[PDB]
Amino acid sequence: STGSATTTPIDSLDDAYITPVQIGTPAQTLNLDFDTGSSDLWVFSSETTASEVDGQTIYTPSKSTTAKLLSGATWSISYGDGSSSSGDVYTDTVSVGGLTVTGQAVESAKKVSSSFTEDSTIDGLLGLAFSTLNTVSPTQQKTFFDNAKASLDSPVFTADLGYHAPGTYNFGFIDTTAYTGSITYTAVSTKQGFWEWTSTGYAVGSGTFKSTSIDGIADTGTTLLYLPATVVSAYWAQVSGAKSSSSVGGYVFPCSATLPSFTFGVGSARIVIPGDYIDFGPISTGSSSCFGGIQSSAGIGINIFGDVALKAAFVVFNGATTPTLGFASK
């Protein structure tokens, strides 16, 4: 089997991407944030505290003839931005782009933090990291990809995120029309539960490539590119007036700037992030200070190749017995 679904930016800045997902019988379609950095599929639901729902589409398990309470199971998750959610668990039929999994754990939120309530465009998360990170207790649950993989034509999914435009998540096949050149594959460590790999270096604008190993994760659920402070300083030093602002919480730059590109290495190959992809707009409405899309990972404990990086590439998440990642230009 295969599946193919369009993923759409939630706003004009590509702050996140939503992909429609069919849950239950009859189908209830919710727009979920596909997140290769976490491993829980959770949804706003009829169980979510009413004051914490503001415009999201909810899953109502009592209206699904295939929903079953997973007795005793609870979940609770927190993300790197301080947001969180928790609840109980159903199993139900879940389909993405024509690919159907029966018995998928659908984690129903009883509580969500304020940033979730405040974002009416995201109805939940669909985790695509390794199932060892799944938070369901006392019986850990498998991700949608893990449940689907035996049925897929090939045990892979691909992320093709757009810049200010829709893109595609494919399951079970590699669309050879969706990228240019060849796909360069690179080793993955699953020891932390992530699609963790080692970039071979970087360049800023037209500058010379610096060969240096950068361990990080391919994370579609993180908006920005978080890299070591040395690398980020080298990038922003090429932007007149850019500075790190403690009050804002990262590097900012004059909105009048033209940003340089940023290149990262995948083996001997190179992925170029155009400068415009690094502009996250005014820090507050009407400001001429703009927020940078490349930020330091120094406070995080891991480097994160988030959407800013991944949207410059066609990315293969290869879930073969030994997982690997593939990157192609597009």
Ligand X SMILES: c1ncc2c(n1)NCC2
C-beta of 60 vs 83, nearer to ligand X: 83
C-beta of 67 vs 219, nearer to ligand X: 219
Single-letter residue type at 146: D
- Alpha carbons 303 and 230: distance in angstroms, whole number: 12
3-class SS at 327?
A: strand
Residue nearest to ligand X (CB): 221
C-beta of 37 vs 319, nearer to ligand X: 37
Nearest-approach distance from CB 121 to ligand X, in angstroms: 12
Find, among 81, 78, 101, 97, the residue nearest to 16 by Cα: 81
Nearest-approach distance from CB 200 to ligand X, in angstroms: 25
The torsion angles phi and psi of 255, rounded to 5 degrees, stand at: -60, -20
Rounded to whole angstroms, what are the CA distances from 300 to 103, 134, 297? 35, 20, 5
Q: What is the 3-state secondary structure (H, E, C) of 185-250?
A: EEECECCCCCCEEEEEEEEECCCCCEEEEEEEEECCCCCCEEECHHHHHHHHCCCCCCEEECCCCE
Q: Which of 33, 35, 40, 219 is catalytic?
A: 35
C-beta of 29 vs 83, nearer to ligand X: 83
Supply 167's token pair.
């893109």
Nearest-approach distance from CB 118 to ligand X, in angstroms: 11
- Does 35 participate in catalysis according to the annotation? yes
- Alpha carbons 220 and 325: distance in angstroms, whole number: 13
Find, among 70, 88, 69, 86, the residue nearest to 78 by Cα: 86
Nearest-approach distance from CB 219 to ligand X, in angstroms: 7
Nearest-approach distance from CB 15 to ligand X, in angstroms: 10
C-beta of 39 vs 261, nearer to ligand X: 39
- Does 206 participate in catalysis according to the annotation? no
Which residues of the shown chain bind ligand X in the complex (CB under 6 A)? 35, 37-38, 79-81, 83, 125, 221-222
CB 320 within 8 A of CB 172: no
CB 195 within 8 A of CB 266: no
Nearest-approach distance from CB 129 to ligand X, in angstroms: 10
C-beta of 93 vs 296, nearer to ligand X: 296
- Alpha carbons 40 and 32: distance in angstroms, whole number: 11
CB 274 within 8 A of CB 312: yes
Q: Which of 45, 64, 86, 199 is catalytic?
A: 199
Q: List the alpha helices (DSSP H) in 69-188.
A: 114-117, 144-148
* Catalytic positions: 35, 199
